[PDB]
């Protein structure tokens, strides 16, 4: 009853860990312990690796269609248990039920995209490129893969890391978030129910020690990560040290540009939705707003629209944003807001002293709007990972483009304007690949990895050149 | 007596034929004999077949990249010599300069499409479908191919036949139209200048005997033909009885439904242009249309728009309607007009009596309009291949759809209407997949195959697209289990 | 007492035929009447076609995902009833339980292949299927699932001699949530094929097996203007090089040549021992003798009895003609006697050698457990012999040398060449099948 | 009188460098100074970068079809002046006329391949897939021995719409100058291509300069790693097409004569100064008995200047290469290995002062010897032996770096087993060099490298 343990998943059994280190799973809305996740031991991780290795050959020999049937049945089962996963997410991570449903829906979309890989697995051939010389190439699995998610999306991150590696024929060793592993456990249960061969998927919970193990052990051929730039680069280097390939989303510091010729109502609505959605904990979200020209006059309207947000627990009906993941995150956000205020920034809206009825012991932080910010301020450089919207002011679109380009870590950007020529100019001049015209977050799916990129990453390309004569 | 003859293309080099039988080349604007074409003898055809066979191995060993580079050089030379080809077409076939330009442009687009067959020639593979079981897929050239073009397109059909057959590794033995061969000879000269190895393309002439030889000769692996229904069926039969694959795009009496909720003036202009453009000689011409409800009130406007066409030789400025290719075509058109008259159809406008100033010697026929037609009229059964616009009496969309379905031979159909639900219902019940909205004739789009299986087409495969590759190549699948314990 | 009567499938319910032409079906292992099949009347076939027409709109409007889920549930139901289907096929067709399980496995494979039709575009309409007695389970799962998932309603006419397997399959399909009237099944003789070809309601027809029957069906379809993908059968020529694995090659030959009593649509019934490979005839005969001939349900059996006594008579007549014409019979099974099943249509493994290409056995389709062996001195002669075959769909080459296999695959005119493996790609259709069932 | 001086190519104008530091170009057949290459000054490199920047807008605005026609005209010009390029190559690098012609033909084929980028470059919520060029590209050439490579780098970067700053081999510039002249004659806009010469300083500038967007390098692994690190440090996207040692496995059932001929041609071909050379051979099973015939075939090779008729392999580019090869062979000799054929004492008649090294065959070599670890880049073939295919596969896998590998055998089962169990990407069956093209994993990968994808998502409406 008390402090319910979180079991592991090795081979085909939900074996429980006997480790010494244990971490408590707190509800972000009440700080009440709802579970205890163990830090997997060296022996348990070795057993998981052995299971992955033993399952690798059988799963690889399995035809691509046979594997894809498993993913199809797994997607169907997920669709059947949508409400259960949504409620588990709302309970553990604290996000609203609608946010969890949307996350599971994006995960289903990614699973379908992976199921659609069956055609890409075929290789090309060129008969008789020269006299009696044939050419053809093969795509084969790499080996044992792994994934890491410190505190980000609990379901979508696995639902994009693991299904692709499976469809490619590899075995996956997932290290889910130490704070929200229940969703991953339910997903693994639904998978095992889908008829997946035992040992194809293994799950081990652990702290930085587990990440170091995964990076050091050689049997891991590839590793995937999504999170802060620091941990991203750290894992990338630790993997490259051992030769194994690694891919990581290191930053999502998106900049939103608002031109004077834009729909004020819809623009402000989308800005408030993307900036404070999911309490700003989501990696991809408009956090830096650039007002060009007379757009500065919309600051009072922006603050008014932000005041209309309803802070409440993820389970209470009529909620717009949930509490933060941990009290430490709230303290960090408060310290960052205090630093911004000390550096001369004006706090148009302050949520540090928010008090939710019936959940005062939760990690809630109200919508925070910071204006008069400059590129040299901490609020601009540091990634908040919270419901804080920093606003900068510029006179021409060239200044906004330059500010956006100065951002070293940036993958998604948006511009709000009705002039198509202005949008095209911004897209051509901006140094960001993904651009959103009147869209807050283009391609909300986790990516820099999909389509051709995912296959090229999770499969090696063998090339055979044979010239038989006699 | 010996009017300047036209060159042949044997052994990858322009040479003359030793035949004693010649066919006169008449300018349709003046019926002047501008040239003569001799039917290739058995010797010339045998030499062409031998050269194609000799070139087949080298042209197949020739990497697809080099073939596509040659096709690109040919595209470039066409783009440079566009005006010469247009002049040749206008002089020989008689169509206006604009029609020749459009023909050359469509041929250039088809060449560009053929240049992108890179991913199509390559095969698929799937290693280890089971324990030690590798599957391979290869597409190999067939051999020497033959092509018979109609009298309508001395450029478009040759430019359909050359790019695909050549890029697929096959050597082609082309047969142009005896009434318009010069344009094809100039196109072949440009192709040879583009770097085409000698022997990959060969040109012969002959009305019926050459077709019989091509269909009977065993070295011909495949045959491509475009023309009438009876001729296409005869060619298909003569080819299949010898074991050779044949594809024939035969007559296609496309129908255009005129809905009351459409652009009136624009729809009428498009109908007038399609039914009378290039003297309506196009086999794919929109010679028939359906007037639904209010569309029938516009017949006076049809007559007005028809009278607005500048009936003049194709070389004069502003010419809209050209002359008939030969006096026999004009005779057939006039006989069909007389038959429509006898059947009781209302010929609202008759261009049978119109003549062109300064070109009365030409086989000119003005824009003719026949309205109040129903499936009972014989002119609806037969195709005019001339400047005759047929419009039928109809009351509802379902009746028009049924009338169009009653047409046994038709490859394309269109409907003029701004209502989306109307076009949806039309496409759902009409027996045609190539449906166009507010367009008289769906323009070819070679990136996919020109699908057709009605009485207007013979053969299980089509000319270009995926089906084009399937036709000009042979699919071989190899399953290998290399294991020795 | 009263032999069971197989009912038709119309409007989503099993209904008994009103016709009096109740043909009797015998078990091939005992030639005992296990049931009767009626020749559907004109009225019953018209009602089935009308039901298919009325059901086509709803099934076509159904989303592709719903049809895919239906096919997945049907595959699941088959997996749950694989044993029953295999036992029914063995009792009705005579082949061994292993062969029936393999047929069900190929059915599952083709269903999974059809599941990949997520989106490629429209359905034509009423589709028809004509299946011979070669494969009761596979042929339906070859034809009707594709047309179904593509949005078309299918009218299946199974083999008159083995309707039970497809009837249980259709029952399981209806259990999978298939809308009523989507799939219709009728029975009848040549008259049924004549109706299906004449009735303009049918827009597409699928047929396999006999060559002349397929030609007739294609001609009738072209006469009535219907899409007919008549994939007629063809002989398969296997070439054995001296450097090939003797044991493995002989095992493959014995399995493919005599497997399922050689009644399958395509089998490696011809072997060309080029070079010193001819010296392997003793081992081949010994391996053929090791085969066990017994009822499909008795443990320890490799090949079952023939479909009907007429098939046995025809096979015996062909073997006698080959012997009289000059061919030497290395192994004779015409007078085999299975213990407890002497009345069956059993025919022991037969091996014929010294057969020239112009002989009857080489030209005629045996459709039985007979293996004709030819000899040559160079691979070019074998390639020429294989190319001379007008109707050749599959060919195999056994060799450990890569250059030899590559030369054989390149010089041979056959489209499908299986190197070191017999009966390559036993499934053929595919995306061309989608094009066929669509417009 | 004085030796000719190589001149830079900036802004479409062949300009002589005003630098003080100069480097001499020696004929590898006689070591005679035939030319001088200058050390590009900071100002000249800045001017070249400025020219590339000013030319990038116009060259990017041009449609892909115009660039394709330019590449076609350049290919035609190359086909016309193939003999001159071959002569210059044989003069500067020492390769035989046939080898130089083959190099020119491979470059022509790579240009033809690059021409096939016509459509691949083009690439309520709308989703565009525009692909745009990066900007000013750069390409450092080998720091050991060259072999084509300009036609690998600049044609693709240009047809993709980018401007290129080419750093040719300081030891064989003339070919690059002739190619640049032909390109300028092909109608290429001035400033689209710029060429500067220099030592390590030039590489440091190219890697550190901010305007450079991408860099491409071929050659040894050390310089490759250095350039990759220095580029990634400044945010540069770089692909290090590093060379690697190749391993060819021979089975007892392989074609004896053909296998020996192909081995002798791939190992001692072009003096072994190629990253594609099959510098090592593994004789599995009874294949060991083929050593005498291999030595005889190696002896049959005739060593002579690249211009003299009847030459199979030419001399080394510099005497330092000969010294390094001699030191590496002496190391293997001291380490216990045996030399079946000694080429150190080769003395070409009439060219005794050239950098010639005859065919060398080393046997009994183990994986721990320097000959196996170090890249010889010379006419040296180390022959190993094993008793089973598993040992050869394990030896091939143990090698850290590798791009090409070959298996000589007639049994398809053995070939497939080797191809599947081997950890190398390109596997050749009865072929020493599986693909003499710039794969070094440029095709679709090159298209993706020289272009940046932008998935413009828009909810724009008439409002």
UniProtKB/Swiss-Prot annotation, chain A:
Gene Ontology cellular component terms for the protein in this record: mitochondrial matrix; mitochondrion; nucleoplasm
EC number: 1.2.1.27
Domain of life: Eukaryota
Localization terms from the record: Mitochondrion
Annotated binding of NAD(+), by residue: 149, 151, 175, 178-179, 228, 383
Keyword Oxidoreductase applies: yes
Enzyme class label: oxidoreductase
Keywords from the UniProt entry: Acetylation, Disease variant, Mitochondrion, NAD, Oxidoreductase, Phosphoprotein, Transit peptide
Entry annotation: catalytic residues: 283 (nucleophile)
GO molecular function: malonate-semialdehyde dehydrogenase (acetylating) activity; methylmalonate-semialdehyde dehydrogenase (acylating, NAD) activity; RNA binding
Residues found modified as Phosphoserine: 228, 346
Annotated Gene3D superfamilies: Aldehyde Dehydrogenase, Chain A, domain 1 (3.40.605.10), Aldehyde Dehydrogenase, Chain A, domain 2 (3.40.309.10)
Biological process per Gene Ontology, one example term: brown fat cell differentiation
Residue positions where N6-succinyllysine is found in the record: 13, 18, 21, 42, 83, 95, 330, 342, 357, 469
Record keyword Mitochondrion present: yes
N6-acetyllysine: modified positions: 13, 18, 21, 42, 53, 83, 95, 264, 296-297, 330, 342, 452
Catalytic activity: 3-oxopropanoate + NAD(+) + CoA + H2O = hydrogencarbonate + acetyl-CoA + NADH + H(+); 2-methyl-3-oxopropanoate + NAD(+) + CoA + H2O = propanoyl-CoA + hydrogencarbonate + NADH + H(+); (R)-2-methyl-3-oxopropanoate + NAD(+) + CoA + H2O = propanoyl-CoA + hydrogencarbonate + NADH + H(+); (S)-2-methyl-3-oxopropanoate + NAD(+) + CoA + H2O = propanoyl-CoA + hydrogencarbonate + NADH + H(+)
Assembly, per entry: Homotetramer.
Family label: Belongs to the aldehyde dehydrogenase family.
Function per UniProt: Malonate and methylmalonate semialdehyde dehydrogenase involved in the catabolism of valine, thymine, and compounds catabolized by way of beta-alanine, including uracil and cytidine.
Record's disease association: Methylmalonate semialdehyde dehydrogenase deficiency: A metabolic disorder characterized by elevated beta-alanine, 3-hydroxypropionic acid, and both isomers of 3-amino and 3-hydroxyisobutyric acids in urine organic acids.
Protein name as it appears in the record: Methylmalonate-semialdehyde/malonate-semialdehyde dehydrogenase [acylating], mitochondrial
Gene symbol of the encoding locus: ALDH6A1
From Swiss-Prot, chain D:
Top-level EC class: oxidoreductase
One term of GO molecular function: RNA binding
Family annotation (Pfam families): Aldedh
Chain positions recorded as NAD(+) binding sites: 141, 143, 167, 170-171, 220, 375
Positions of the catalytic residues: 275
Keyword Chloroplast appears in the UniProt entry: no
GO cellular component: mitochondrial matrix; mitochondrion; nucleoplasm
PTM sites of type N6-acetyllysine: 13, 18, 21, 42, 53, 83, 95, 256, 288-289, 322, 334, 444
Keywords noted in UniProt: Acetylation, Disease variant, Mitochondrion, NAD, Oxidoreductase, Phosphoprotein, Transit peptide
Subunit structure of this chain's protein: Homotetramer.
Annotated protein name in UniProt: Methylmalonate-semialdehyde/malonate-semialdehyde dehydrogenase [acylating], mitochondrial
Encoding gene, per UniProt annotation: ALDH6A1
């Amino acid at each position: 009853s008390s402090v319910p343990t979180v079991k592991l998943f090795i081979g085909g059994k939900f074996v429980e860990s006997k480790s010494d280190k244990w971490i408590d799973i707190h509800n972000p809305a009440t700080n009440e312990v709802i579970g205890r996740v163990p830090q997997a031991t060296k022996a348990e991780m070795d057993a998981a690796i052995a299971s992955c290795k033993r399952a690798f050959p059988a799963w690889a020999d399995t035809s691509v269609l046979s594997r894809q049937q498993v993913l199809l049945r797994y997607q169907q089962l997920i669709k059947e248990n949508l409400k259960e996963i949504a409620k588990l997410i709302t309970l553990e991570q604290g996000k609203t039920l609608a946010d969890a449903e949307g996350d599971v829906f994006r995960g289903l979309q990614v699973v379908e995209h992976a199921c659609s890989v069956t055609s890409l697995m075929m290789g090309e051939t060129m008969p008789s490129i020269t006299k009696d010389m044939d050419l053809y190439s093969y795509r084969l699995p790499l080996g044992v893969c792994a994934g890491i998610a410190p505190f980000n999306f609990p379901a979508m991150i696995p639902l994009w890391m693991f299904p692709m590696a499976m469809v490619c024929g590899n075995t996956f060793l997932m290290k889910p978030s130490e704070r929200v592993p229940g969703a991953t456990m339910l997903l693994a249960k639904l998978l095992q129910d889908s008829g997946a061969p035992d040992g194809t998927l293994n799950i081990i919970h652990g702290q930085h020690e587990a990440v170091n193990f995964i990076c050091d052990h050689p049997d891991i051929k590839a590793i995937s990560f999504v999170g802060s730039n620091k941990a991203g680069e750290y894992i990338f280097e630790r993997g490259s040290r051992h030769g194994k390939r690694v891919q990581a989303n290191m930053g999502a510091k998106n900049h939103g540009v608002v031109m004077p010729d834009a729909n004020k109502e819809n623009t402000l609505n989308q800005l408030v939705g993307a900036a404070f959605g999911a309490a700003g904990q989501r990696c991809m979200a408009l956090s830096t707003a650039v007002l060009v020209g007379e757009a500065k006059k919309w600051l009072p309207e922006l603050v008014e629209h932000a005041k209309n947000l309803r802070v409440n627990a993820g389970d209470q009906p009529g909620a717009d944003l949930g509490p933060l993941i941990t009290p430490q995150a709230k303290e960090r956000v408060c310290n960052l807001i205090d630093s911004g205020t000390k550096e001369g920034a004006s706090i148009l809206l302050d949520g540090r002293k928010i008090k939710v009825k019936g959940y005062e012991n939760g990690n809630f932080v109200g919508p925070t709007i910071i204006s008069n910010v400059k590129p040299n301020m901490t609020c601009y450089k540091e990634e908040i990972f919270g419901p804080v919207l920093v606003v900068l002011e510029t006179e021409t679109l060239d200044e906004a483009i330059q500010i956006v380009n100065n951002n070293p870590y940036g993958n998604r950007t948006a511009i709000f304007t009705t002039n198509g020529a202005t949008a095209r100019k911004y897209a051509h001049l901006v140094d960001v690949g993904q651009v959103g015209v009147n869209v807050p977050i283009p391609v909300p799916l986790p990516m820099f990895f999909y389509g051709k990129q995912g296959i090229q990453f999770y499969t090696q390309l063998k090339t055979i050149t044979s010239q038989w004569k006699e």
